[PDB]
Amino acid sequence: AFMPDARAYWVTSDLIAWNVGELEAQSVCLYASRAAAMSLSGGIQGYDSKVELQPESAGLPETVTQKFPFISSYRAFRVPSSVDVASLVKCQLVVASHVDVTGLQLPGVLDDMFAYTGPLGAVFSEDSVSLHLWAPTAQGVSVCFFDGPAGPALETVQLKESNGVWSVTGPREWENRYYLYEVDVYHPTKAQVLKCLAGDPYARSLSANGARTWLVDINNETLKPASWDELADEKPKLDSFSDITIYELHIRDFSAHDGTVDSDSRGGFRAFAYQASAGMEHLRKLSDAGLTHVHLLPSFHFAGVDDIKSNWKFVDECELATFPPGSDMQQAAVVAIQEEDPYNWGYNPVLWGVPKGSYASDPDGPSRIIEYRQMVQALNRIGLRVVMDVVYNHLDSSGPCGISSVLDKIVPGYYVRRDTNGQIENSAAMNNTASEHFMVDRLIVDDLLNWAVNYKVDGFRFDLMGHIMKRTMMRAKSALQSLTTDAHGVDGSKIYLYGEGWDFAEVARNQRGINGSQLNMSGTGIGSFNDRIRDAINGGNPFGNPLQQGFNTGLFLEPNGFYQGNEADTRRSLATYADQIQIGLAGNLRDYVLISHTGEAKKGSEIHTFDGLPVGYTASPIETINYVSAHDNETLFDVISVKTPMILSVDERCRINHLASSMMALSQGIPFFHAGDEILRSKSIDRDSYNSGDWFNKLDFTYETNNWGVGLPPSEKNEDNWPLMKPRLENPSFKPAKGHILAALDSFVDILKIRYSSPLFRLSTANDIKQRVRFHNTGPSLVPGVIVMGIEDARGESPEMAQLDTNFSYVVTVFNVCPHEVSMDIPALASMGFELHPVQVNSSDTLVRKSAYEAATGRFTVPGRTVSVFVEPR
Amino acid sequence: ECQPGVDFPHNPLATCHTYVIKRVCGRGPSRPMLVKERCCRELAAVPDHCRCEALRILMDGVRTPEGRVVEGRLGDRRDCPREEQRAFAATLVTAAECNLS
Ligand SMILES: [Ca+2]
Ligand SMILES: [Ca+2]
């Protein structure tokens, strides 16, 4: 069978690029076959058209190479004017030259002729409903209408193409129908023209499992909860982006194990709308402390979870508890059902504009739209803005087959990124998107506006932002900010953006264009995760050796037996990690000057990580997302239980968990917390719990368990680390009790209140941090494992700076990770009126209370494994 | 002269150890290309004249005067023997992988 490879490119309507011999380029012909009947028998047979492609001497012009840099050295071929380009892109195409046959990659020529900016999806008029679909390679597009989500077809209507856009205008009565598109288009992966049933890319609602698209008006009164149009007045106050703290939560985890919530609402949008559930009281406590934002994991239509709840499988949660804490039997029961369970993170995008059906009470009907809007409203009313995890980097499926393939079904080989052979790139996970293409770029921005206007979302977290073009990131930023209350019902100036700025794969070093990596996103005002501070605190990296120690895991202070060099090597490594944290504590700035462990005064960018790049990479503190844990990798409690000495008590590790969290909360920039960090959450040392079910991802709001010691985690992801997990799981002294969990939560709440008791922790500009923030325990003479941070404010008669704090004039924070008490002597902070913060004076922990200050020598006595905050009152 | 702790870090290519397991044994964390990039960045951070030495320590490890190995090595994994892991470990510098001299 004829299955060609795609090494040639159609870049503009009159130019084809191909990397062939300078002489063999004199015999290149372009072949076309609408019915795709081409075969080999030994030249080519079964073609419609045959036209000579004339080689160009000059090559590819700059305007082409600036869009596609990875093919800049390719030979240029001219396409004659006699050729009807619009008709040939709808056909099977090959270029042939001894005999070298290959296909054409079309996105380039599709953006040149068929770039569209007008209406798409469904447009509602007073008397009419019109549909619009972008498919410039389709031979024909029809629309199948359905009466419900299950019945046969009512009608079939043809669509008229205009500039690659298929359109049709019908009556008002079309509203509330269910529909599918009928597209006959050539698919290169099957090498034939197939008549495909596909959903709408601009869908606003779907039936169960995205079987059919619901033709609904999103502006409908019957879809708005009470006082929805007046939510802008109800939304919690946001003075600046510097006041943001983020709490990362997964929708199902929140209420899956919550008994106080009805079983029909458990693990869905309704749970957040409860009056006085355990989960909503938990979010209320943090919000009153100072928490501002809630980041929820993928809520849009993804594959991996069946919307029809009757198909869901479960594990015997009684008999599984009778197994040993370090057994492999628990994971065997979960893996057997993991493909048909109710659990997944949701990193398998199908349609970006529709809320997930499985999180709704009914996958059919207006249920999913209303309950989503209720979730946003309810969180805003308890004082928490809502952030959406957006996954624009890839798609779940591709090809003409499957219920989970939508975009690649309608326009094959355009929405997905492909290599120089035409194979799809899988670097993000599977089926990478190509945001460099015009219509993909538009689809992403139109989606971000959909969630901002129709659902009133307060921010977005970009999964693999480095796989998305900066161009797309900047246009989305300007569009969201331009939204006003009187025009669209939402104040767009308060919407904040951030994401994973990892630079890797076929998009690295700007190979496909200026991509949204941490370094490129410097000075843009869009946040990015500080992976430098993350690794410096925990030790090593998520993909490194599990036993690698860091600053907050006793690198030099408390060796764990694993060889990391001699005493002098570990001590020099500990002082290096401390220098990286301090830059992050000062907002991970490019231009912030810090005295490093050698005594040398270095700028943030001049301090590098041990393997290449600069530590400080931001121009503004609001571009920094400080964190020690997320949904990815192992939880704070799990990583501390592995890295730190095995002889330690759980009470000592509990204090270490508080240190890591507090370092984030008291840092300049934006703190990021994983749900459960307050209550010592465990996943039983699981590093990839995306498909581990409810068993390993359990969040307990009864505070009875932290989910530590529920068997060894699934094999495929953790099997090789089982020998270093088992004895830690089997040891009862590793599992914390009810008293530990509650004390860790109360200690977490206290720190948040300290952050919002002073505007000095939340400095808005880079120049403010330079002048005010000073570190003290520096040089070759520093006390290891101690970070001293001081923030200065306008004091005395005629000060240099403006006054920002009305209660305090100076704040000093001491971070101590040493197993014992430390006595500091700082001459610069001598003869000052310092005292312990009123929150820590009334603290439930008796250990913190022993913190003291002396005005004589500037003495700071801070207890072991403790963070202390000192203040100078006005 | 290529000493760990002086010319390159202790446990030189720990990220490459996990990447070898994902590729040969078929087990490890998701997003394998993100793991690959850090492994290649760890390899490129090593000076050119020490790269082959640091690659050997990943494969075989350094033995102490005391007698035991510390900074390596490629051990035995379930259905994934040492010599199978070792063969792929040597091809990490080649054009098909990290592409380094
Ligand atoms: Ca709040
Ligand atoms: Ca699953």
Side-chain angles (χ1 to χ4, degrees), chain A residues 95 343 397 450 537 541 558 612 663 666 722 742 777 841:
Chain A
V95 288
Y343 201 87
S397 296
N450 167 44
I537 288 162
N541 85 98
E558 285 174 287
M663 278 190 283
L666 298 163
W722 281 11
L742 294 165
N777 191 59
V841 183

Side-chain angles (χ1 to χ4, degrees), chain A residues 304 338-339 341 343-344 691:
Chain A
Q338 68 176 342
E339 297 290 278
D341 77 341
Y343 201 87
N344 202 292
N691 204 23

Side-chain angles (χ1 to χ4, degrees), chain A residues 532-544:
Chain A
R532 294 93 162 94
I533 200 166
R534 183 202 63 182
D535 291 321
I537 288 162
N538 288 315
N541 85 98
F543 309 121

Side-chain angles (χ1 to χ4, degrees), chain A residues 259-304:
Chain A
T260 71
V261 180
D262 131 273
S263 52
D264 293 305
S265 303
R266 278 205 275 267
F269 301 128
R270 264 222 299 255
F272 297 89
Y274 265 67
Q275 297 284 262
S277 63
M280 282 300 288
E281 285 177 5
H282 192 92
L283 294 177
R284 196 179 301 162
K285 189 174 189 175
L286 300 168
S287 188
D288 281 303
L291 195 73
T292 56
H293 287 71
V294 184
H295 161 211
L296 305 159
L297 271 77
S299 54
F300 56 85
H301 176 55
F302 61 81

Side-chain angles (χ1 to χ4, degrees), chain A residues 428 463 500 502-505 535 541 543 545 562-565 569 572 610-611 687-688 716-717 719-720, chain B residues 5 9-11 14-15 18 21 26-31 33-35 37-38 42 45 70-71 77-78:
Chain A
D463 189 64
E500 286 186 313
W502 315 144
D503 204 0
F504 73 109
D535 291 321
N541 85 98
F543 309 121
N545 201 292
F562 181 76
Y563 185 83
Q564 304 167 75
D569 285 339
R572 203 164 82 255
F610 77 104
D611 56 330
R687 67 173 170 194
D688 209 19
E716 197 197 10
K717 298 283 169 182
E719 201 194 325
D720 301 304
Chain B
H10 294 286
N11 303 285
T15 312
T18 315
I21 301 161
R27 282 173 285 114
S30 53
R31 300 170 182 181
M33 294 295 288
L34 182 64
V35 184
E37 196 77 17
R38 187 180 270 268
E42 278 182 351
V70 280
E71 285 164 331
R77 306 284 157 167
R78 204 267 289 171

